[PDB]
Structures are given as structure tokens and as C-alpha cells.
Amino acid sequence: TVAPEKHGPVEDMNAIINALPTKVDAVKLEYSASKTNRTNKRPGDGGAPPP
Amino acid sequence: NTSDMTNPTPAQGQDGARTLPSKNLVLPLPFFFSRDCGLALPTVVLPYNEI
Numbered sequence: 001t002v003a004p005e006k007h008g009p010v011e012d013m014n015a016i017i018n019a020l021p022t023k024v025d026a027v028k029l030e031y032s033a034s035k036t037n038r039t040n041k042r043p044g045d046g047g048a049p050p051p
Numbered sequence: 052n053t054s055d056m057t058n059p060t061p062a063q064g065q066d067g068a069r070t071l072p073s074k075n076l077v078l079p080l081p082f083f084f085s086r087d088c089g090l091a092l093p094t095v096v097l098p099y100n101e102i
Contacts, residue, residue: 041099042098042099043098043099043100043101044094044097044098044099044100044101044102045098045099046094
């Protein structure tokens, strides 16, 4: 005659879910590193000026 | 076609047992820039194309 109430499991959530931002900081650092240009846009140049 | 590399040689047990010599041969490459001195590739002018 009443709507059943559903909640979380018996075990606490935090022990399983945990919290450690090392992965996301690693991703952000990798993205910031890749933001700078790493390829060459002057092929067949020889960018050494004459002495 | 040095009259030595194209001369037939029988097996080692026959009268002709000379081995075909190993040496260096040169082949010029006929290209548009190689055909005339007035036509030369401006590598200094082309810093964006790889040849």
C-alpha cells in the first residue's frame, strides 16, 4: 500500500568510491604540455643562418 | 656494357670459369633541373615543400 524506499547499500560509499585527483592533474598537465607546438611548420628549410 | 659484365661465362668446371666482377656503376638522373644549368631548384626560396 506504500511506495518502497530505496537507499544506498549497507557498506559506506566513500570506502569504494575514494577521492584522489592525481589522475585528473596528470591529464591536465599532459594537455598543457601538448598545448605548445611540437611539430615543424618549415620542412625543407635548414634553419641554420649563414655564419 | 663494358664487354666484361655481359660476356657469357660457363660453369666453374668448364673452360670459362671467370667470375663476374663486382664494381660501382653510375646512372645520372635526367630531371628538369638537371637538363639545363639555367633551371635549378630554389631550395632557399622553397622553405615549405619537401622534395
